[PDB]
Amino acid sequence: LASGTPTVYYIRPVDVASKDSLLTSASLQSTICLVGDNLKSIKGILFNDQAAVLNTSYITDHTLIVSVPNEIPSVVTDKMYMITASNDTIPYDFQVTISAPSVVSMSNEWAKAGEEVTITGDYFLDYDNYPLEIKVGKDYTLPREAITSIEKTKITFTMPEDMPQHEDIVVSDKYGSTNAPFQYMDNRGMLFDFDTPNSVTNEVLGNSGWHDRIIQSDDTSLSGNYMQIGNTGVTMAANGKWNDEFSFEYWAGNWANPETYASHPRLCDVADFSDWTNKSLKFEMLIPADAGWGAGPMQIIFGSPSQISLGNAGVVDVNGVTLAGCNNTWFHAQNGWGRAIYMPWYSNSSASLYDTGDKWVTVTIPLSDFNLEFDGNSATKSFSSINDFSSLNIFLIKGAYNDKSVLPDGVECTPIIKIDNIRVVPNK
Ligand SMILES: [Mg+2]
Question: Where in this chain does the record put each Surface glycan-binding protein B xyloglucan binding domain (predicted)?
Fold first, then answer.
């Protein structure tokens, strides 16, 4: 309608109670107001390469109100292009604020040199004028040649031989830097690597209960010894029936009276479980392709010395706790006790054989998700103290309280689950 070249003196927000009186940037879908003259000479507006929608009814010759498009720009120039009726382009420098990268998981936090590693998250956006980078520590930057592909949710790279271990990992791009919730060869909050003696009793923790599991190392090892649940040809029923062949048990204590925990210490003394709601249980896991896991949910149960211990019942420890002794009722006592139940073989109301292609993958289970009970219903008693992380059970079983079960059946299988590097780590 109007004539002349549009100008913009400044950009202000559109709502009344705004903190800002002027904007040099704006998020997606943000409604902004241009303050210039001859603004009705504007026929189109593009933010970067994204065209905006102009409502003629709210465009005076001194104010134009437009909302930033929702789509992420593919080529970012930090300019808003105003197009006149004659298709002339008038650029006004203006940045479209995009969320910083979010880092959630790494495929194998213990990946060896040469292995294909994928980092899963969101807002991994790579541009020519501003490349995304992975920085480990303070002096190392991941070479771009190691990176094979970058998608919005996944970054894929080939692990160099010399990436710094046990250091912070930062994913940075044009829109900011964010620390990864993991480290390379992460050993923080280390509980069972089955190789290194623990810091308190100078013992390499392993079996400490009734049903001892395989702990060995061979050509399939990720790092030294691993712990194995199941074996070749050992059948797991589709209904997840009780079978101690799929139970790993570490019970604190070693038949001492009084129980000093001089042997088999409490897990809460081996690693720090304070502020557990902001922490997660992590471990690396291998399931052979020929030994898929398709039935029997994995119940990971932490317990206090009041519930379970390696010894006789009635013994008191150096903490005044009356030990429960050896038992297998504490994790199914119908008392609302919370435990995590991991079941990747159950995907969208249907059960299938889950394996991991004979590779080691890192599994993250936040301690806040230990809120189920043996039957699968929501747990009524949460964690109350760090003392509740003294013993650990890993049991592949579908529980059924009072002949009723909420967890689902699977398919009959012969699963082999190799586990190493059981640790507890901060969520961030
Ligand atoms: Mg190991």
Answer: 184-426
Assess whether 339 and 417 both reside in one domain: yes
Method by which this entry was solved? X-ray
The region, left, alpha or beta by phi > 0 then psi within -120 to 50, assigned to residue 348 is left
* Spatial contact of 204 and 265, defined as CB atoms under 8 Å apart: no
Residues 156 and 174 in one domain: yes
Rounded to the nearest angstrom, the distance between the alpha carbon of 350 and the centre of ligand 1 is: 33
Find the 110 Cα to ligand 1 centroid distance in Å.
Answer: 10
Q: Is 122 annotated as a binding residue?
A: no
The domain total for the chain is 3
CA–CA distances in Å: residue 330 to residues 248, 251, 309, 322, 334: 15, 12, 10, 14, 9
The Å distance, Cα 222 to ligand 1 centre, comes to 7
Resolution (A): 2.2
Centre of ligand 1 from the C-alpha of residue 50, in Å: 51
Q: How many helices (H) and strands (E) does the chain have?
A: 1, 29
Residue 2: inside a domain:
no
Is residue 195 a known part of a binding site? yes
3-state SS class at 122: strand
Cis peptide bond prior to 258, omega within 30° of 0: yes
Residue 420 annotated as lining a ligand binding site? yes
The string of DSSP letters for 220-278 reads T-SSS-EEEES-TT--B-TT----GGGEEEE-S--S-SSB--SSS--HHHHS--SSGGG
